[PDB]
Design a protein around this motif. Sequence first.
Motif, PDB file in Angstrom:
ATOM      1  N   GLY A  48       0.789  -1.239  -0.183  1.00 42.07           N
ATOM      2  CA  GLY A  48       0.134   0.158  -0.117  1.00 42.07           C
ATOM      3  C   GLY A  48       0.763   1.276  -0.127  1.00 42.07           C
ATOM      4  O   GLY A  48       0.337   2.575   0.039  1.00 42.07           O
ATOM      5  N   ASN A  49       2.164   1.247   0.049  1.00 40.45           N
ATOM      6  CA  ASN A  49       3.156   2.452  -0.029  1.00 40.45           C
ATOM      7  C   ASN A  49       3.109   3.118  -1.435  1.00 40.45           C
ATOM      8  O   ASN A  49       2.889   2.161  -2.404  1.00 40.45           O
ATOM      9  CB  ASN A  49       4.481   2.317   0.487  1.00 40.45           C
ATOM     10  N   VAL A  50       3.635   4.216  -1.566  1.00 41.08           N
ATOM     11  CA  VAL A  50       3.464   4.798  -2.657  1.00 41.08           C
ATOM     12  C   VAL A  50       4.890   4.670  -3.393  1.00 41.08           C
ATOM     13  O   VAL A  50       6.061   4.541  -2.400  1.00 41.08           O
ATOM     14  CB  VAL A  50       3.097   6.166  -2.789  1.00 41.08           C
ATOM     15  N   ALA A  51       5.203   4.570  -4.546  1.00 37.80           N
ATOM     16  CA  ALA A  51       6.444   4.306  -5.107  1.00 37.80           C
ATOM     17  C   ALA A  51       6.318   5.015  -6.536  1.00 37.80           C
ATOM     18  O   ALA A  51       5.226   5.334  -6.934  1.00 37.80           O
ATOM     19  CB  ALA A  51       7.037   2.998  -5.259  1.00 37.80           C
ATOM     20  N   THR A  52       7.495   5.471  -7.203  1.00 38.64           N
ATOM     21  CA  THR A  52       7.624   6.032  -8.359  1.00 38.64           C
ATOM     22  C   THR A  52       8.348   5.122  -9.213  1.00 38.64           C
ATOM     23  O   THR A  52       8.962   4.283  -8.833  1.00 38.64           O
ATOM     24  CB  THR A  52       8.685   7.373  -8.350  1.00 38.64           C
ATOM     25  N   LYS A  53       8.120   5.231 -10.410  1.00 37.94           N
ATOM     26  CA  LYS A  53       8.702   4.402 -11.616  1.00 37.94           C
ATOM     27  C   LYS A  53       9.210   5.617 -12.658  1.00 37.94           C
ATOM     28  O   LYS A  53       8.115   6.312 -13.234  1.00 37.94           O
ATOM     29  CB  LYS A  53       7.784   3.303 -12.270  1.00 37.94           C
ATOM     30  N   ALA A  54      10.253   5.431 -13.041  1.00 41.87           N
ATOM     31  CA  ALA A  54      10.758   6.562 -13.922  1.00 41.87           C
ATOM     32  C   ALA A  54      10.589   5.942 -15.266  1.00 41.87           C
ATOM     33  O   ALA A  54      10.404   4.736 -15.459  1.00 41.87           O
ATOM     34  CB  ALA A  54      12.319   6.864 -13.856  1.00 41.87           C
ATOM     35  N   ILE A  55      10.215   7.116 -16.196  1.00 41.28           N
ATOM     36  CA  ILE A  55      10.169   6.676 -17.634  1.00 41.28           C
ATOM     37  C   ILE A  55      11.309   7.854 -18.600  1.00 41.28           C
ATOM     38  O   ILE A  55      11.722   8.813 -17.744  1.00 41.28           O
ATOM     39  CB  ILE A  55       8.971   6.912 -18.165  1.00 41.28           C
TER      40      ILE A  55
END
Lengths: 300, 237
Positions: free
Chosen positions: B36-43
């Motif tokens: 349930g935590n937030v994470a980023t994925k780079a593009i």
Amino acid sequence: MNTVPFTSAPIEVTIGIDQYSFNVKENQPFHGIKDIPIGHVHVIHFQHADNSSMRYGYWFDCRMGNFYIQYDPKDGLYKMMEERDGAKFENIVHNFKERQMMVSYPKIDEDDTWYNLTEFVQMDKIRKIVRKDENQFSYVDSSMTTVQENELSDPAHSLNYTVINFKSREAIRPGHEMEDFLDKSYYLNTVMLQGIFKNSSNYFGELQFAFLNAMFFGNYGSSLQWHAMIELICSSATVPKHMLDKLDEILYYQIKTLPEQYSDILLNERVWNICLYSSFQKNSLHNTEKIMENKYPELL
Amino acid sequence: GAMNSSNYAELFNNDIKLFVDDTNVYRVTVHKTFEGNVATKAINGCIFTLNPKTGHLFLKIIHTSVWAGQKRLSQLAKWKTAEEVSALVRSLPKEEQPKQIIVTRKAMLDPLEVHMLDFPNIAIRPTELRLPFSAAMSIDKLSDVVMKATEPQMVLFNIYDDWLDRISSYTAFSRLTLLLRALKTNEESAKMILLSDPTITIKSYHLWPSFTDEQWITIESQMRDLILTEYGRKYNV
């Protein structure tokens, strides 16, 4: 104990010696300052009653010779000079004391203020910042500009402080642009400490001298130099522990000694807030932080 | 100093100058993790470096691999931008190197200045203009080349297609910024306007459709109308 006699006092002037000062009236029989503690540098400074601009003065060390003050009615200012005739000089000093026309350097025995402000200041380094090698003492005034200021006019009258510039090739190794600009440790420790100043004590001495010049003469380029040298340390992640602790003491006594009314021009808001609260060394200046908050919370 | 409405025509004189926009250098999606935590994925992103006088665009594609194992990425992105712009200047012959670089965001000044220390006669300038170059990834061909990249890559374009055969730089730049302003404020409408008429095609070597002069007038009016409407909507005017 040493003496700096005055030939006369022809013009109404406020005289300072280190952190003390006295009002002297036009042609008041004033003839010197006695009981000056041997072992430290000292500064005698002046501000005429008629020109509350141009504070000026002379840095000296009584071990290096016998010095005295004489008013020059052509140039219009109190000049320091050296008497080479040691006998002729003790003669003048003894008679003025006998006639008790001299004020005593008024040091309280509990008080280490002047020691703390001048701990690393050495006459030999002062004479390299104020180059005038025919005198053993150094003139400074309100309006003298620094070498760095001159680059951005008369070099004989320059303060040759060490040039610090965070956006220069000196400060920034090729390939470590971002590293060296965010963490000035390289610049501080290799370029400035090992390279130019050789040790921490010379660095502290110039830092202290720049502060005293800003405080005593309102010398603006000196204020800039004091802040730059603080900022270089506080913006380095890797600083010898002995330098951090000593810096905290140095700054404490400088902030303690500053006139309360001058905090506005003498203290750079950005630098202090960055050093005390944002920098790598935010937590390494506990005494300096405590006195700044209790005395100048507005600036912060 | 800073660039503004007053000194706007300086862009079209014969002193070589480049705009640098870093808004699309570090691009992420935001998503929830299993716990349930937030994470980023780079593009993939790009540096947008543009000569406003000639239309030449130096699109430096920033591959997600640049970020691997790095911290404080938003800060790093500014220094990588400055690193890449400096390398671009170094790669150009002397007589092609710019006399000024105008950064669209003030946070870029110190990084570029530090990276340009070898070029003390190249002036690094901020701007007060609110330029819409972030919408560059709304140009289909630019977004396409960025997202397909498998490695760091520089792609060159003329962002004005062939307009300068018929109009001045001043006008070309005004058209470009109008188009981008519109794409920025309502991309779906803006793109609808540009393509509504299937008989007006985009040349293989162009970014925009091959409008006639008269059709560009209708287009520019349609983009202006779009922009004003969206304003009243945003502010209830």
